[PDB]
Design a protein around this ligand. Structure first.
Ligand SMILES: Cc1ncc(COP(=O)(O)O)c(CN[C@](O)(C(=O)O)[C@@H](O)C(=O)O)c1O
Ligand SMILES: Cc1ncc(COP(=O)(O)O)c(CN[C@](O)(C(=O)O)[C@@H](O)C(=O)O)c1O
Lengths: 401, 401
């Protein structure tokens, strides 16, 4: 009877755990459609061109590796605030915001959730859409808050339950927290229409809810960054002080370098100055200061005009390509002879497709074809290339036949 | 009355907060002697030679940036386990250990403290030496445990209170947690003598305490890595299953890239397999997966024979140099005419000197001379170069005169 004899075997991650099993498969045809990760049209990991050149300059600069302030590299801190908010922004231009570099999206989410646990004096309830990014629960639940839900997807239809959403939303108790995904809602890929968005804006403002925005896909929903941040900016200009979390994992393909940011819209510059002090104190007994390489790559790109341009050409290139694969997917399905309606594939936006497949169908895809996706039926179309679109399609067809 | 109006201004970090103030000073003679950071003999940030070459190979390799498993890069994971444990080790050779890449030392400490909060069923008490690394409190206290103390320094003497230590230690309740620093106890730079260490080993084993080892300075205490890990290995071979935290911030000068590791000595390989599962689950709702660059730099050096050799030559070079500055310090003091006994400067080991200066003396050093150190009288001698040894010495003398 040792210290840890009582410690039982936990299960593998629901998403992350899929790459671990994918890795062991010997099928030379295996496809890893589970994590949200981008592959080029040869189905190879794609390290963006502006990333490769930003590395070379850091390199060339011969930089030191000294600890960064607890809140992160300032330029990166400020360049994100601005990319999230728009440069003309009154919030941004008044300096009533505090952005802290975090350990990507996940890590900004958690510093935030931990900020709310500690200073969000009006409620312990965080309302997540139905469904949501499976990690959002444990994020919030280990942080110390309570989890709730509001209706969002309509599986009979393959779209938003806008009536059910505003019924749940207009009834959440005042001063509660509501998580809303900026764009490329995960795992559904169905976002409120701008129209829908003005209405949610109203109810949130009216019920006085703390709006927490998750923006892990900025530029993946429409292929335009500014367009993808509309919703967030529409909120803030309606006078809603939201908190937000950003990831550069996907739009800059910085996955394992981990660069991301957590921001709070405050009342004045002075309040901003005090929420910062307190966020630092929270982050010091955590990991002390943040990972420098991603932060430095991102900043040089966000802040060097030509790198900023090259990056948007490349973000667009990525969005288009997912599109081309959606398209090509539905068509081989028809071609294979599927009888099913696959229109949601092409209708959905972002890196995934919320397919509808059941678990037995997922399970045989894995086992007869070496096609790994999450058991909720989600596949990452981001990771399909010109050369296995045909394979997936036939597989999807066989197990669906 | 906004969401955050009640949020008050917190104070700046006790250590980290010193670099922030140092930064603003305009004195062309300012010295930053507060964080534990290495400067070369020109008093410039030193990016080690094996680091610079390990970067070039990664570069050259054209590597991807795909997410790393939740526990980190395997090679790095395994190379640290081994650097901490020795290759002949029965623990290591039996595979009864689980090492997880963490967000440096701070970040491994916290995943660990959070592991103990969740599975350490026998106590909520962590005993820290008197004094200890100021961040150890909030680390453990935000994690959810209780803080206690055992006597360690003897300020009348400028050494260990070994009698007072074993009295407190032999009286800690059974199954409690005791933090012990591997080598280069911070902030004192006074370590148990090997002899002392065999005795502590006994009491810990005898009272059945969970020993948690902090090893942020491996190779800084004696200039030899294996020698610096004696104590930890002596423990484990006495049959004490400790947990440990490692930082590559200082011995590899990876400060802001953040590479570090948290390890648990378990009973069998199978228990190891289950503590891992559970550590992952704990880390997924935290920052999800860890920062890749430091982990990749460290691994290539730990695992490539010539990089391993070059790194130990360089670790030694660093240890010697701190020594040369201790030496040179005491001597300009004599030379300036100090009457005081400065023998502890040269007696103490690691990156610092626990000087004895009081707070008024610290305060005028900052203000008349632009010499920043922590208010506990700690200075980082690591950061003195051949060219300002004379400056510091005269300053120390003036305010001490
Ligand atoms: C909606 C949402 N929010 C936050 C994140 C966090 O991402 P990161 O911490 O790397 O910056 C993801 C990534 N979701 C996944 O791509 C996915 O396959 O769902 C995957 O990255 C994951 O980490 O689960 C996400 O989809
Ligand atoms: C005793 C101890 N344990 C853990 C750490 C954590 O370090 P890291 O998270 O970077 O890997 C430090 C660093 N202590 C300091 O150098 C110091 O001046 O005390 C400084 O790095 C700090 O972070 O406070 C330390 O001295």
């Amino acid at each position: 009877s040792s210290w840890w004899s009582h410690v039982e075997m936990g299960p593998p991650d629901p998403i992350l755990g899929v790459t671990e099993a994918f890795k062991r498969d010997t099928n030379s045809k295996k496809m890893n459609l589970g994590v949200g990760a981008y592959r080029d049209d040869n189905g190879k990991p794609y390290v963006l061109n502006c990333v490769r050149k930003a590395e070379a300059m850091i390199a060339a600069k011969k930089m030191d590796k000294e600890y960064l302030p607890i809140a992160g590299l300032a330029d990166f801190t400020r360049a994100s605030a601005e990319l999230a908010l728009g440069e003309n922004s009154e919030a941004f231009k008044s300096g009533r915001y505090v952005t802290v570099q975090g350990i990507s999206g996940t890590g900004s989410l958690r510093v935030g959730a931990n900020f709310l646990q500690r200073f969000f004096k009006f409620s312990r309830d965080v309302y997540l859409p139905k469904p949501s990014w499976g990690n959002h629960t444990p994020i919030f639940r280990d942080a110390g808050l309570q989890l709730q839900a509001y209706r969002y997807y309509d599986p009979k239809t393959c779209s938003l339950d806008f009536t059910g959403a505003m019924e749940d939303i207009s009834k959440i108790p005042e001063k509660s927290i509501i998580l809303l995904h900026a764009c490329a809602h995960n795992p559904t890929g169905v976002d409120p229409r701008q129209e829908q968005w003005k209405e949610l804006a109203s109810v949130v403002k009216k019920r006085n809810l703390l709006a927490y925005f998750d923006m892990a896909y900025q530029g993946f929903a429409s292929g335009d960054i500014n367009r993808d941040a509309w919703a967030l900016r529409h909120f803030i200009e309606q006078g809603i002080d939201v908190v937000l979390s950003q990831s550069y994992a996907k739009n800059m393909g910085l996955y394992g370098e981990r660069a991301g940011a957590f921001t709070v819209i405050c009342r004045d510059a002075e309040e901003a100055k005090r929420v910062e002090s307190q966020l630092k104190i929270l982050i010091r007994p955590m990991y002390s200061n943040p990972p420098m390489n991603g932060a430095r790559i991102a900043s040089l790109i966000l802040n060097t005009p030509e790198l900023r341009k090259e990056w948007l050409v490349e973000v667009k290139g990525m969005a288009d390509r997912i599109i081309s694969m959606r398209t090509q997917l539905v068509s081989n399905l028809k071609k294979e002879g599927s009888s099913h309606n696959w229109q949601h594939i092409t209708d959905q936006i972002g890196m995934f497709c919320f397919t509808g497949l059941k678990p037995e169908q997922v399970e045989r895809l894995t086992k007869e074809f070496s096609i790994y996706m999450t058991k909720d039926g989600r596949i990452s179309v981001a990771g399909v290339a010109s050369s296995n679109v045909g394979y997936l399609a036939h597989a999807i067809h066989q197990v669906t036949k």
